[PDB]
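Notebook, student rotation project (T.W.).
Task set for the rotation: take a protein with a known small-molecule partner, predict the structure of the complex, and write up what can be learned from the model alone. Partner molecule chosen: magnesium ion. Sequence and SMILES entered below by T.W., checked by me.
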Amino acid sequence: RRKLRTRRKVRTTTAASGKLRLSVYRSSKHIYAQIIDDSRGQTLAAASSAALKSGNKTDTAAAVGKALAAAAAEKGIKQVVFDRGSYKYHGRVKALADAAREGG
Amino acid sequence: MKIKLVRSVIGRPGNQVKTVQALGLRKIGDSREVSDTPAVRGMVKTVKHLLEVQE
Amino acid sequence: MELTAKPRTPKQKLDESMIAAVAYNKENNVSFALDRKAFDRAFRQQSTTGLFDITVEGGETFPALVKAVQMDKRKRAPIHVDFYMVTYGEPVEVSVPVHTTGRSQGEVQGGLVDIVVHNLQIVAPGPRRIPQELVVDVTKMNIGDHITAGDIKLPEGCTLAADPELTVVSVLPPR
Amino acid sequence: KRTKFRKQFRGRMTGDAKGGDYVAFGDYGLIAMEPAWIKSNQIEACRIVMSRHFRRGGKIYIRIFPDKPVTKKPAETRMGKGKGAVEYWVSVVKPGRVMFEVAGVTEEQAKEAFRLAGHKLPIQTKMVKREVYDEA
RNA sequence: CACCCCCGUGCCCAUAGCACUGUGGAACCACCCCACCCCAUGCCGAACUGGGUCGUGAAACACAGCAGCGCCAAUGAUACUCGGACCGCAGGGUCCCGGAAAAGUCGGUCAGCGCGGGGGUU
RNA sequence: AUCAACGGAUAAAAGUUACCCCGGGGAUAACAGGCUGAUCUCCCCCGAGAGUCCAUAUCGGCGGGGAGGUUUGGCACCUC
RNA sequence: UCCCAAAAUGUAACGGAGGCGCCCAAAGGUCACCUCAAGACGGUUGGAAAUCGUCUGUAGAGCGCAAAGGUAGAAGGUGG
RNA sequence: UCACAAGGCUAAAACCUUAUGAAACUCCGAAGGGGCACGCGUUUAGUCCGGGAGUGAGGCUGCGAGAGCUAACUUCCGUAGCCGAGAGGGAAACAACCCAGACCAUCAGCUAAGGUCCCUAAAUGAUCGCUCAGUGGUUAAGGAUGUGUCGUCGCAUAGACAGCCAGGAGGUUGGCUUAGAAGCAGCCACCCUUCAAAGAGUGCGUAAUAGCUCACUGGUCGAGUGACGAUGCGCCGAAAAUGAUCGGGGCUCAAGUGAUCUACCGAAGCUAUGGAUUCAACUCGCGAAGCGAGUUGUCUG
Ligand SMILES: CC(=O)[C@H]1O[C@@H](OC2=CCC(/C=C(\C)C(=O)N[C@@H]3[C@H](O)[C@@H](O)[C@H]4OCO[C@H]4[C@@H]3O)=CC2=O)[C@@H](O)[C@@H]1O
Ligand SMILES: [Mg+2]
Ligand SMILES: [Mg+2]
Ligand SMILES: [Mg+2]
Ligand SMILES: [Mg+2]
Ligand SMILES: [Mg+2]
Ligand SMILES: [Mg+2]
Ligand SMILES: [Mg+2]
Ligand SMILES: [Mg+2]
Ligand SMILES: [Mg+2]
Ligand SMILES: [Mg+2]
Ligand SMILES: [Mg+2]
Ligand SMILES: [Mg+2]
Ligand SMILES: [Mg+2]
Ligand SMILES: [Mg+2]
Ligand SMILES: [Mg+2]
Ligand SMILES: [Mg+2]
Ligand SMILES: [Mg+2]
Ligand SMILES: [Mg+2]
Ligand SMILES: [Mg+2]
Ligand SMILES: [Mg+2]
Ligand SMILES: [Mg+2]
Ligand SMILES: [Mg+2]
Ligand SMILES: [Mg+2]
Ligand SMILES: [Mg+2]
Ligand SMILES: [Mg+2]
Ligand SMILES: [Mg+2]
Ligand SMILES: [Mg+2]
Ligand SMILES: [Mg+2]
Ligand SMILES: [Mg+2]
Ligand SMILES: [Mg+2]
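Predicted structure of the complex:
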């Protein structure tokens, strides 16, 4: 049910790992990939898609994953830890990954 | 406040002794003055019944 | 009724025979103390739906129904009373003793007039026109008939907080 | 009387009686004065006593109940080797606590049936009538 | 966060919950559509998941109403009790002085504080 | 390594003594006394029935309160 | 292991219950995924209980064995 | 979670109202207790390293619990104090209890517990009371018009509780039951006639009758009475072995006991004076240390 999301949410040992949380919302056809210091209740990146995506749907992945990692490299935020929620990591969000996994 | 020792120490608990000691009274008849402050006046609550006290 | 004191130290009373006290208006709450004698008198006179007046030794009469009594379990006398200063139109959920009326036909064939609930938790008449008791005719009952909270009567403008099917006063068999 | 299944064994202590010091189930009610123990037979006693007096038959409420296992070692052994087998059962009646409620009889029947009841017990006792109204 | 509002996410771990209920659709969410392969079912696109709409506001989600339930909870008073003293053969009980609940009653409440985003105020 | 008598004496081991001996113990039992009073002994209260009828002339269930210190015991305090 | 144990650890008794001298090649490491006991209705063998279905459903289950503490964001159930 | 009092209700299990017990139950949960810190304010100890040990049988009361029989001068833990290793006063006598920790001297003073008629130091004290039982000076369930205090309830200037006066009635031997019960051996019921009043009635009785008294009613008399609790203090219940008694004498015209005040007696504790030792600081000399001396504070079962 919720279970999976809160499961990964805690296997992101909130702040104690030191690094930066990396959200997603690939459950709609509007996503939301985010960047959090989670300790400080703030968000530091933000690659939306609702202000015009491109035209693609799940090809959009690598793209907002390149836009995010771009806004990151700009901010200075140079290190990853990949949150999700109800997501398998395999296809769409996996693209977002690969092109964030080298995209910032 | 103003302290006097009238009841002895014998037959009485370890702490009540050690307070009569660490108050400075070493035998009955003994008299004294005390800094009207907490701790040291709460060292005269504890062993009250052994001291006749003034004000 | 009438008190005099309201501190935290009770040597002003007790031996001199007064009861520990509270009474809340709900915006006004006050601790105090009221002579035993009068309280016992009126409280058996008037009880848990009694309503009576509080002319504190200051000059400020008040309207008081009796709410909770708390007593010396051993000596079996009361030592404390919770009050409820009544308001105006809407009141509370009055507790009222079920009685029994008439020479019942249930006791002529070996049965017995048993009140399976000595007291009844109703709802609101208005805090000035309260039922003190209740009157449940029992005559029609034989042996084996109970009286549910539906069959219970009403005086008008009142509601029954109690489940309309649970057993109040029912006749029991002989032996 | 006795119970059905349990733990087996016990101990003891005192200090006043919890509840219920109030006159439910009946109009008239008899109330302990001493921190006794009470036994299966000690109460079955008053059962059969009052149940003599009321005839057919009243309505009788034994507000107490034996739950305590009390032991006695086998007679004549020096202590050790065990705790005593369960001799008898006990209701740990404390004071102000009310033991008997009856109604379905009059005032005289309460007075007397309670008198005869209380002449069977290790306790001084007082009988009375309702008004204990925290909860009926 | 400029005002509302929706999407993601946190501090807070029920005065923040549930049921009853009304608002809610292109503006986000959701259902929906199809799935030969990615990918998946101890069988089945139900779920994880790949293609993308209309359609529907129903369901789910969000908001608001709401004190029926849960939750929270006084003051007074009491139990018990530190330490002073005492009574009864004893089971146990009292007095002075402080600390002091539990449960119940008065009541209280449809939480409250953030960050970023999208989207509107002829 | 049931060296399980589980910090484990030898690799390796059971009885009996009324023929009995030494060293000690009232540190410990049988005797007595002692403290206790369950059991034992007796007395009191309540009365349910018995006594044709009538609890109490006598008798007294189920149960309660005590005494006494003569029983069998418990405890092991003076004396081994 | 649990009371006894007097709200810190500790504590005796020939006091009050019960358990161990193994088991596991997966029951471990990791990775991923699933959620429980029951009751109501309704259903071929059945029909107290089997299987399926739905509404309820924070633990009223499960953990190889003893119970206590613990646990549903898994320690529980299934695979690479 | 195991237990369990009544009642609902159904086919009882559940579950609702009412309701309670728990060392091995816990929605809740103190008082205390412990760790750390601080020393905000006192007091003296602590910790390490090295030499010498002894002890490893404990005992009693108070509060906590277990085994016992809410037995033991009982036993096994916990906890405080005491004796052990503790003299002194008190508790008649009495390791443990209440006061109190004895460095010597004194033919000096104040107090503690505990006391103050004589033994025996000190008020045969003062005022408000209680009990009359020698309680005091050893126990209980249970019983008592003992005697004081508070409170409930009822009754009567419309005649009361009691004294004496008269009816204490007809149905109706009510029915049941029975050898007969007809007020009265047991089982369901208490209805009428009149009345100044009178109830299938309450006891003694009879095998059953009958018969004698009251519930009420009226005359009188002249006023209080009657019951159900709370409570101070006394009574009964209260019987063992060599000689009686509270330590004794004796006390109630308190020397008993509840209250309030004040005076005195009382210890080896406190105080006066005089002196000694132990530690320490100060002063001095020989030569830092070190010794004796001196002064002060201190210490000594
Ligand atoms: C001379 C000694 O031995 C020494 O020991 C001490 O004394 C005693 C030792 C033992 C004893 C009794 C024993 C063993 C016994 O079992 N006795 C029973 C019973 O109880 C008794 O009553 C008799 O009745 C039926 O038959 C008897 C029956 O055998 C009695 C003594 O007094 C000491 O004073 C002496 O100097
Ligand atoms: Mg105390
Ligand atoms: Mg207090
Ligand atoms: Mg407080
Ligand atoms: Mg809402
Ligand atoms: Mg060994
Ligand atoms: Mg060997
Ligand atoms: Mg021979
Ligand atoms: Mg020979
Ligand atoms: Mg020899
Ligand atoms: Mg013998
Ligand atoms: Mg012997
Ligand atoms: Mg006997
Ligand atoms: Mg007879
Ligand atoms: Mg003997
Ligand atoms: Mg001995
Ligand atoms: Mg402790
Ligand atoms: Mg030990
Ligand atoms: Mg609550
Ligand atoms: Mg040894
Ligand atoms: Mg010991
Ligand atoms: Mg011993
Ligand atoms: Mg010795
Ligand atoms: Mg001495
Ligand atoms: Mg002495
Ligand atoms: Mg002497
Ligand atoms: Mg002694
Ligand atoms: Mg004095
Ligand atoms: Mg003299
Ligand atoms: Mg000197
Ligand atoms: Mg010496």
